[PDB]
Amino acid sequence: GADDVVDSSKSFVMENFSSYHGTKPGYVDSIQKGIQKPDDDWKGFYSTDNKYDAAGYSVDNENPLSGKAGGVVKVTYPGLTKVLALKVDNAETIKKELGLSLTEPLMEQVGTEEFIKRFGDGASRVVLSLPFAEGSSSVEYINNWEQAKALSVELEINFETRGKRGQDAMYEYMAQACASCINLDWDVIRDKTKTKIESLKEHGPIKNKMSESPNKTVSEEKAKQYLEEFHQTALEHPELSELKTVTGTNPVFAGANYAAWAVNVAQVIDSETADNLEKTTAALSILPGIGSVMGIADGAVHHNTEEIVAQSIALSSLMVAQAIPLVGELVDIGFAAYNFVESIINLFQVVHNSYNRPAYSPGHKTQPFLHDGYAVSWNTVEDSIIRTGFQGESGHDIKITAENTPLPIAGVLLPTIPGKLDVNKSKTHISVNGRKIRMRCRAIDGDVTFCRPKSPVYVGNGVHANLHVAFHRSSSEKIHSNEISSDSIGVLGYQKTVDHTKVNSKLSLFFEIKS
Amino acid sequence: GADDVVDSSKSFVMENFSSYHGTKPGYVDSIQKGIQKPDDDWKGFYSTDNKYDAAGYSVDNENPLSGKAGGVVKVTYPGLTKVLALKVDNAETIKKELGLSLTEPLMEQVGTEEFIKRFGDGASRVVLSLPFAEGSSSVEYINNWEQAKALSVELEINFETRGKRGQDAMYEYMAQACASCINLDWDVIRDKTKTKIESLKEHGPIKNKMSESPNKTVSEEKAKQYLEEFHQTALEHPELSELKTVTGTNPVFAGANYAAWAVNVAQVIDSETADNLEKTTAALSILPGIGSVMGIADGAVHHNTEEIVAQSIALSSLMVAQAIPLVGELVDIGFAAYNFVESIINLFQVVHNSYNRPAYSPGHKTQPFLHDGYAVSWNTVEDSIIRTGFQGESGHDIKITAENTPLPIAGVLLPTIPGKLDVNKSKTHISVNGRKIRMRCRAIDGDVTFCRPKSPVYVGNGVHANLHVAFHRSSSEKIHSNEISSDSIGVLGYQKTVDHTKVNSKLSLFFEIKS
Numbered sequence A, B: 001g002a003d004d005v006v007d008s009s010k011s012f013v014m015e016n017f018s019s020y021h022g023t024k025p026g027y028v029d030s031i032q033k034g035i036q037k038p039d040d041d042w043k044g045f046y047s048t049d050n051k052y053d054a055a056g057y058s059v060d061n062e063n064p065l066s067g068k069a070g071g072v073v074k075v076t077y078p079g080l081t082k083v084l085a086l087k088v089d090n091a092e093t094i095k096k097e098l099g100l101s102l103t104e105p106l107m108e109q110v111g112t113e114e115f116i117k118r119f120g121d122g123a124s125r126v127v128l129s130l131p132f133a134e135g136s137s138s139v140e141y142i143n144n145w146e147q148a149k150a151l152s153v154e155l156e157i158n159f160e161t162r163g164k165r166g167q168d169a170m171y172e173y174m175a176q177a178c179a180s181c182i183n184l185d186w187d188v189i190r191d192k193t194k195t196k197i198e199s200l201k202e203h204g205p206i207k208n209k210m211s212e213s214p215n216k217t218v219s220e221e222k223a224k225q226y227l228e229e230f231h232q233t234a235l236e237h238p239e240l241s242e243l244k245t246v247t248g249t250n251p252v253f254a255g256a257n258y259a260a261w262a263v264n265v266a267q268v269i270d271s272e273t274a275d276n277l278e279k280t281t282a283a284l285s286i287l288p289g290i291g292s293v294m295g296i297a298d299g300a301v302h303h304n305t306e307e308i309v310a311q312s313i314a315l316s317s318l319m320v321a322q323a324i325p326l327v328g329e330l331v332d333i334g335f336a337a338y339n340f341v342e343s344i345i346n347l348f349q350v351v352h353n354s355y356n357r358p359a360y361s362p363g364h365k366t367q368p369f370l371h372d373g374y375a376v377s378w379n380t381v382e383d384s385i386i387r388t389g390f391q392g393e394s395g396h397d398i399k400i401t402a403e404n405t406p407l408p409i410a411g412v413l414l415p416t417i418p419g420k421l422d423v424n425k426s427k428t429h430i431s432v433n434g435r436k437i438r439m440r441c442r443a444i445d446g447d448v449t450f451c452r453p454k455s456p457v458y459v460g461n462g463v464h465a466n467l468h469v470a471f472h473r474s475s476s477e478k479i480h481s482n483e484i485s486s487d488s489i490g491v492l493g494y495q496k497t498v499d500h501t502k503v504n505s506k507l508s509l510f511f512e513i514k515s
């Protein structure tokens, strides 16, 4: 009953149990006067244990994208509060398993004396606990509206009082979460951006380059052509010197990408959109290629300095202005320097926040490694863990497929500890659409066993494989932090005779040793 | 104990319990005389319930790729046999949970009187049952060597007696599994191939085109250039007319791809490799681009006629011959018409076998939909099922990420049955690296609700999202086969103002209604 829906390991009675609530502009002051009710099973006051998670619930409901953020308040229950952690979020299952009345709203029942007597363990009330979200270690608290009347409300922060532009106050606060960490000063970036734009517009070669602008609707291919030369010319400016160095190698940061982005923007911004930050943001947010200007690629935010960020934004701003008359419909005039910059700043902040949050990189846990047309991932989280300290076997499933045409899997490289952790050659195989292919595994240079499929393996649209790696433990001795050669399994795809040195496509699955 | 490792639902006592075993050339006749033993926990005789799965175990152990296939025999146990289905393949877990001696080999213990008395349910012996493989509905039987001595062995098929070339006899037999079904006559294809090659070599314009071959080591870029013109010229031949029509539209079947493939082959075939079928096959099997010649793309085998397959193979054969002197190292002479054709035929057969086997297409069950840089999939099989016939809620997790740079998720389109099956707007959200974004969902034209994220959603390397769709059932009435608008959920990525008509990247997740 209660075992099916309640997580005892994670429930607890606490004195002065505190949590956080994010609220909208206009209510930061009135909410500190008291919590009050402004499916039914879930009608309740919502808080979280994470204040920066609370912050995300503070944006003006009618302008969720660019709107103003209100604040975060701390709500404390005096006395003893019982946090009942739930293993399911289906209310009928909860009411049933907890033997509750299958009719009255779950939350309504949570605030009854009987319910508090039964699962409160002496606490004055009960607050439901649920995981905040997939990919979050935060929890979500669900307070019964009546019991919530006992909450003491204190202010955490009022983003509006910080008097900063856009959602700068909210994002810089959340950034406090990680003290890597992208902790940028947007006031500094906002100011450098304006200065740079100014210096660029008022610039000999740039103004000269502008002269040659067809300054009339031209074809898209000609637009990009002009834009790529403009970009090249603009990057010579002393103000964009660092950006010239940082964007020199990675192809994602090339001029063609800036030009591509610039024309794409100029194309979707009509006059009414441009005269609205919310409308600009919604328009820009669905465009591809924003990574070229943000300097984000290969899993890293490369433009992580106020100086380089401001040069990148100033650069695309100038180009959007050039692109508007060639492939647009409005007066680039303000847009490029006004809402374009305001909207893009906001988007950077959204993406920087994502990378500041703890997340699994490709090939880790059940997160896919996408590369060369292939998609590989550990079938389950348990699969990605190699347990140690016992004599025995273990199996590990790795899912494999390719996007379209049939691509080969040459085999798989596995890290070992010869004697302690070995490949179990008889249980290691790969099934392609069910055809269980046996593998010829051989120890190679450097504590790695290379296993090859006995027959050809190809994956693609409609064709998938399950790589089942079996390992053998010769002793109970725990593998130690030096023992295994590496922390990944390497699935090898096709062979490319590139760099005059033939090599395979490598698809890595990262593991952790435990127990 | 036994509940933890034994699947009662799938175990049974059967009279004359039969199964199949695939064996190597040289043993098809001697194995019919009796089963006899030629980790330890798993030492046993191996059979399966699928004869075409058995067939795959018949290839000459020293030439697993191109070698000769022996046969399949049927092994029958007289009397009553108890098939004990196992829920785990870890022998220590089995011996422990079944209270067996944790020392003696599991299989050794399976052939004891005591063990047969305990779990045989009166049957003369016990055979272990295990799922054959991930992606297979077949089972694997594990016979105790001693008890296996009672088996009656009958012949199913001897591929060698069929007297066909390569592994034609084995693959055409397996093809019998699906009676779509690629059931090709390789003798016919082999014969048409030779005829076509002949007609091409002895052909005015082709011979003329050959004349102009630099016929000496030229650069790779020049090689492809010559090869693309040669290809174009060769496709005009009356013998390759159908192939000219079938390869006209899909870019994967273009001449650049044939030329690319041709030079890639010529590049990896040295003399010793070329004089060995096993070595040729192993060499070719790791090359990319085989889908252009097989005519396989977008999840379908397009070249599915003996006529069109033979034209495709004849065409690449001619080109490999041209590519050898330009970007190779041997005498194209025999290779292109000898082992090249033998090896490629084998590879086609491997891939056709994959597509003949039941498999889940992208976006179905936990199989990923890969498109436009995004990777999306149902978190679990249960998620991909929408259950009906009850009043209540259900949640469905969809995993989302993109390969590299930050790409947007505009929102998600969901099929409904207004009144009966609705979107639960309060529980439907998307978490990006943990940031739980709420969604504005609105009913639109045609029994579809479009939900948009309240704030910008971008995914890419290091950034992932979990789309959690919540549905609401207003009555116990079962959704019927006409009710829901479609069988998929459509996640929308970036917007491309292509075809002068702007559209989003569409990523579909296919579901099934059940219960």
Ligand SMILES: NC(=O)c1ccc[n+]([C@@H]2O[C@H](COP(=O)([O-])OP(=O)(O)OC[C@H]3O[C@@H](n4cnc5c(N)ncnc54)[C@H](O)[C@@H]3O)[C@@H](O)[C@H]2O)c1
Residues within 6 Å of the ligand: A020, A021, A022, A023, A024, A027, A030, A031, A034, A035, A036, A037, A038, A044, A045, A046, A047, A048, A053, A054, A057, A140, A141, B426
């Ligand atoms: N806002 C949060 O901190 C928070 C925390 C965890 C989860 N959530 C999630 O967000 C969704 C909606 O929750 P929500 O709280 O933003 O919205 P809600 O739908 O409950 O609306 C209540 C809104 O009115 C405001 N309000 C103003 N004065 C109040 C007062 N005196 N007492 C109580 N509320 C007052 C709240 O701040 C909130 O913005 C939830 O269903 C849950 O998924 C929100």
Ligand SMILES: NC(=O)c1ccc[n+]([C@@H]2O[C@H](COP(=O)([O-])OP(=O)(O)OC[C@H]3O[C@@H](n4cnc5c(N)ncnc54)[C@H](O)[C@@H]3O)[C@@H](O)[C@H]2O)c1
Residues within 6 Å of the ligand: A426, B020, B021, B022, B023, B024, B027, B030, B031, B034, B035, B036, B037, B038, B044, B045, B046, B047, B048, B053, B054, B057, B140, B141
């Ligand atoms: N061959 C099959 O039909 C079959 C079926 C299901 C699973 N498997 C799998 O293939 C792996 C190895 O099994 P396997 O059977 O190919 O190889 P094995 O390692 O048990 O080797 C025995 C080989 O010797 C042969 N043999 C010849 N005469 C025999 C005789 N008189 N009695 C018994 N065996 C005789 C068998 O045909 C087989 O080819 C298994 O571990 C399992 O994963 C094989």
